[PDB]
């Protein structure tokens, strides 16, 4: 099954800047998110289809996550990736898709829509704590990208 969740967020950063930073997540995330150590491209050019391997630390243990870039829609300031391997995919989970879309907000900032698409095996539903964790991760990454732009104003 596929279960979809949307959350509306705001930023003081305007959407073209955020969107540009989002596309730079491979370099930004290991700097700001303590546990993310590295991002390696396995196949592809950064565009849709690209497979990436993230190396993280959890509890002093090195772990690996696999991502797939799904779609990048500049017209709607949209950047979509999926978690396709590693700890967030328990056996009844197939894939988790994290979509971010931005529009102009009032006061020269942004309104974002964070979509989480939790793909399960067969008739299973998402575990409640897994969903909570997934939403937190999605919002954390958004706030890492935003944090970077707010701390490095000249760069965007
Ligand atoms: Na780090």
UniProtKB/TrEMBL annotation:
<dbReference type="InterPro" id="IPR050279">
    <property type="entry name" value="Plant_def-hormone_signal"/>
</dbReference>
<dbReference type="InterPro" id="IPR000916">
    <property type="entry name" value="Bet_v_I/MLP"/>
</dbReference>
<dbReference type="InterPro" id="IPR023393">
    <property type="entry name" value="START-like_dom_sf"/>
</dbReference>
<keyword id="KW-0568">Pathogenesis-related protein</keyword>
<dbReference type="GO" id="GO:0010427">
    <property type="term" value="F:abscisic acid binding"/>
</dbReference>
<dbReference type="GO" id="GO:0006952">
    <property type="term" value="P:defense response"/>
</dbReference>
<feature type="domain" description="Bet v I/Major latex protein">
    <location>
        <begin position="1"/>
        <end position="152"/>
    </location>
</feature>
<dbReference type="GO" id="GO:0005634">
    <property type="term" value="C:nucleus"/>
</dbReference>
<keyword id="KW-0611">Plant defense</keyword>
<dbReference type="GO" id="GO:0005737">
    <property type="term" value="C:cytoplasm"/>
</dbReference>
<protein>
    <submittedName>
        <fullName>Ara h 8 allergen</fullName>
    </submittedName>
</protein>
<dbReference type="GO" id="GO:0038023">
    <property type="term" value="F:signaling receptor activity"/>
</dbReference>
<comment type="similarity">
    <text>Belongs to the BetVI family.</text>
</comment>
<dbReference type="InterPro" id="IPR024949">
    <property type="entry name" value="Bet_v_I_allergen"/>
</dbReference>
<dbReference type="GO" id="GO:0004864">
    <property type="term" value="F:protein phosphatase inhibitor activity"/>
</dbReference>
<dbReference type="Pfam" id="PF00407">
    <property type="entry name" value="Bet_v_1"/>
</dbReference>
<dbReference type="GO" id="GO:0009738">
    <property type="term" value="P:abscisic acid-activated signaling pathway"/>
</dbReference>
